[model samples]
Target: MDITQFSQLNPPSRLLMGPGPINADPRVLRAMSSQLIGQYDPAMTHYMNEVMALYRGVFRTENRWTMLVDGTSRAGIEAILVSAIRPGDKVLVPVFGRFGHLLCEIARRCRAEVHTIEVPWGEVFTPDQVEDAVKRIRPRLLLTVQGDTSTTMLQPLAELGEICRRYDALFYTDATASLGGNPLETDVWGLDAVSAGMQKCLGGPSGTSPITLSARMEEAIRRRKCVEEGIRTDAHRDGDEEMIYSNYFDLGMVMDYWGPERLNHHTEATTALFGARECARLILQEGLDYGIARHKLHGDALVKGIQAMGLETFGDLKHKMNNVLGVVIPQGINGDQARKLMLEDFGIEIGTSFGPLHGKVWRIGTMGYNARKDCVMTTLSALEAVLNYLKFPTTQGAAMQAAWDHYRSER
Candidate 1:
């Protein structure tokens, strides 16, 4: 354990084509290296405000509440869940994949009287089906994941907002994996609340979240907003308001800290904020729709490549998210071993799915900065090599050729 024995930090370059935590855009990494500034510094304050505006564009909402949560994407989810769901409130969740069950667990911990309706893995709930459950359950909030990474499924949420309105329920969704790679028309689609992480389609490292809340959802959260006892003073008052369970996850205080008032919540994670700002700024500059189209182009190419390699894709293709794909593992092919080879030999990473789909399918992502023609072609070539190493049948060069044909057709 000699200090002199410790080696200088050296991390190998990797192409991340997994269910997210994708390669951070070099621009984002550069942004994170901006000289540190004090939280209340005027420069830092303006940067914070600028970040809010940047993420609003990213979330496709004019919500004044759009801002960064100082943790991974799940912190954003916990913020919304804790701030919005009061204890004993009835909540409805639709379980389609691992992240769906995550929503159920977080709500349950919030002391919600949680109810769930489910579909088989690799499928999403229909509006009619969700509406049926909404009518019967009469829950206070409807929790969902727009794209559940574990299953590589994007639940269609464009129609569920109206159903929540009819039932007098608040609608919230975690768009962590779907935001930049798909069209998330927040206002147009009538989403009450949505949160996303930087590690997914935003092309930044994990640790910061971009979230937006509609006015209705904002009001509901405001009613329960109370400053923590640790920070309470004679100057501030949240009279008669119920306290949010977690001080850190309380959106009201976080909002006050982010708002014009500039109240203190937690010391912002300054580096992560810089990274989030650059990620959204880059995406917005590229144009959200254009970025989504980029994902589609690469996603389709990857799908075509894998399919041509003689692998079946998992789930209803009609409902799949544009960012990620589920390629079913062929019989007797050691899935993890192939993934390991792709990692160690190729310096590329693909994902192994969770729960029911574990070891049954590979979740390859075309997201963020990695959603490119080279990434698609390179990953396919590497995968073909690994599959061949495992003695799985695949024609040499067919995958790359298929991907090239897809790119040609798109152009």
Candidate 2:
């Protein structure tokens, strides 16, 4: 019995400036290591209720159905899709980036008839285009991502939500990248369902999935709550043709678990919940609007710095995500090698784009606690060195100097 391999797991930590799973705010980390409790402890329910209240403020919505989905960002997305859609349901998805494809694929998995309205890779759909799609498909719901980390695009939601509402379609958005890092008026924008995660701007542990749903969606779930006892062989089916297949993903059941009855569901992830609570608390302490402004300011400074260093941004700055930047992989620079060099030598970790833009661009994020001047300068300074080493014609101190100037001046 030689089982002595358990102590070989030490890993080096680096600054996470990549697309996501960024450095959890130190407060969030401390919160993670907080006191443990039994799942049904009165204190645990109090914390859960606190989490719901916390996220309602984070989401800027009063929707009573808002809560965590006990999984990753995609899990929340899947839960919302499964709970909100039924077989043969029509869903309009406006595809602008990689996440749009995710929405379409998940809805398709739910057996919904998905109609996608695609724009160019970096561009987004206007309300006019969405209106046209709505007229053509008459979808039961409309799903879009508020921020696409792949292309670094932040799609506007206000008009899109109104458009979906006008057509009597429930509107949902995946705000995984933009939540807490940007300003989102959930009530003002009329979103029915929204999902976000901690890996991005929320700056916490990544497992818990925060979601919000409107009354219509909650009602739909109410009409479909699974009978927990004496399982029927056709548990997946009800007399209603619009039966949802998943029991766990059913928001109705999730509601029952979170609501007054406090019925047994999965024991909430105590550590992730602690982290989520502190994450929301920190954002509130900083002032949501101020945090968003800081994210935008830092991102803008980085964008301007890269431009000044002769590195071009990949997409339109006007429509880009406020907390992440995607810059072209310059000539003569090995993108992966440069990223590795930055990480190994300076403890920095920037990201590269995925799908079509992979290896063509690097995605640098300025989010949550990392949304600051030092973060912008450190990333710019290190990137400048990597480019110079690759003979990309970068001026010695020009990059950092220009970055400083960007912070000092107005456009």
Top candidate by lDDT: 1
Candidate 2 lDDT tens digits, 1-411: 568866786768778899988888998988888889997899999999999998899999998877888899999999999988888889999999888999999999999898998888788678898889899999998889999998888888878877877789898899999999877899889998889999888897689889998877777766666644444345334434344587678677678779997766567788998999998999999889888888988988888888888888877778888899988997656889998899999899999888788788998999888888998888888888877777778666777777788777854
Weakest ten-residue segment in model 2 by summed lDDT: 232-241
After superposition on all CA atoms, how large is the RMSD of candidate 2?
2.6
At residue 32, give the lDDT of candidate 2: 86
**Per-candidate TM vs. native?**
0.97, 0.95
- Give lDDT for model 2: 0.85
Error of 1 at 381 (Å): 0.7
Cα lDDT tens digits for candidate 1, 349-381: 999987677789999999999998888888988
